[PDB]
Amino acid sequence: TNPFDNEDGSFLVLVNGEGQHSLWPAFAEVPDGWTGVHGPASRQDCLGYVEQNWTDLRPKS
Amino acid sequence: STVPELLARQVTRAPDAVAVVDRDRVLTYRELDELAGRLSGRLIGRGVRRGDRVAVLLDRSADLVVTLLAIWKAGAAYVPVDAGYPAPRVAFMVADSGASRMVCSAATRDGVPEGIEAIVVTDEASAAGARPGDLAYVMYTGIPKGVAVPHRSVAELAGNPGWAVEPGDAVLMHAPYAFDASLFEIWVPLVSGGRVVIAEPGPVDARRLREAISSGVTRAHLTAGSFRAVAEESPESFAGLREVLTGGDVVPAHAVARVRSACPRVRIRHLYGPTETTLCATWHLLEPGDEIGPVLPIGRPLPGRRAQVLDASLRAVAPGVIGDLYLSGAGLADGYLRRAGLTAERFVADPSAPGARMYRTGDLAQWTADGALLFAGRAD
């Protein structure tokens, strides 16, 4: 199983300077330029956070 | 950049060069620009505003090219709908994309869903102008999803120096404009100064390809299925092309070898990539005279793109090790329209590029020692 699809994994939500959101496996170092804004939490919980809070896809810039 | 910006450079440089050939109708670059400007004015007058999505339901034709460029000049994004789709699929694409207007023809008028304003293309010039961060199109890709692609990504693809398309080139146009291959067929030649040759109605078979080549076509893309068929049945039919391109489904090395032995001088290019990264992210070019050997690579990232093969811990693997393929750099879509959660689980943070995203292909791959990629099947 791909780690981004692991339903039993622990996950973060990350945001970059453009306001784009990413799911992220909590075991992995957060890449430069990304900030954790939610988690560690379930995969489904992180998807709910993104749907609620990432209203516009376009980069904020 | 934007494709309209790259196109304007060609219109200035050679306004009277041929841009579009459709049966007996021929449009120069200046004529195409002026026709699209007039249709853009019509769209603005009908209420099209920046960021709107405009569905398109047309048969391939010069009018199709005019329409796509006009939608862009109005600041809007096109939602390409294939005239052969069933009505429930068409209704879904229009509603899910948020399009309130659809450009159609007399012949397709009956396919416009109820409640959607029909704009019949056969009926003053003004332009808002395309912008790099605005959406350029929404292409649908087993539940249908809308991939929202910005102008900047389309321009990164179409203007890529690796295409090597020149003003003397003539590219055969026959792929559905709903599909990604259309970007090569239509926008690559137009940003390069070449011409788009609209194929006669119906599927392009070996005989029609030979006729197109005799008439001056120099480059043609075939789906993997059509390429394999012609390669095995009539590989000499590619003779006279400067380059044949193919991708999508699997292409066995044997098919490429058949073409090379029948046509020693034709460049053969294999393309790989999902709709989410704009037509193709990697490619493999077989130069004239070179033989393919036992495996056909998916190749190397296009100029301006990057690929990573990572293991289940998200660490890069060494060459010859199969892992998960991720695509990054230029050409990424913004995401999936109206589906931020799905976007966030497939367009993920890129550990190798600050603040950047990489697209999780769901495919497996391995590197060769010198930096090409071999496909190793879908992960599922």
Author numbering:
A (entry chain D): 2 to 62
B (entry chain A): 9 to 131, 136 to 153, 158 to 396
Q: What did the article's authors report about this structure?
A:
In this work, we have sought to understand the evolutionary history of lipid II targeting glycopeptide antibiotics (GPAs), a vital class of nonribosomal peptides used in the clinic for the treatment of resistant bacterial infections and exemplified by vancomycin (Van) and teicoplanin (Tei). Since ANC1-3 domains display polydisperse elution profiles in size exclusion chromatography, we instead turned to the characterisation of an Acore construct of the Hpg accepting A1 domain from Tei biosynthesis (A1tei), which possesses a homologous pocket to ANC1. The MbtH-like domain Tcp13 also exhibits the anticipated fold, containing a 3-stranded antiparallel β-sheet and an α-helix adjoining the centre of the sheet.
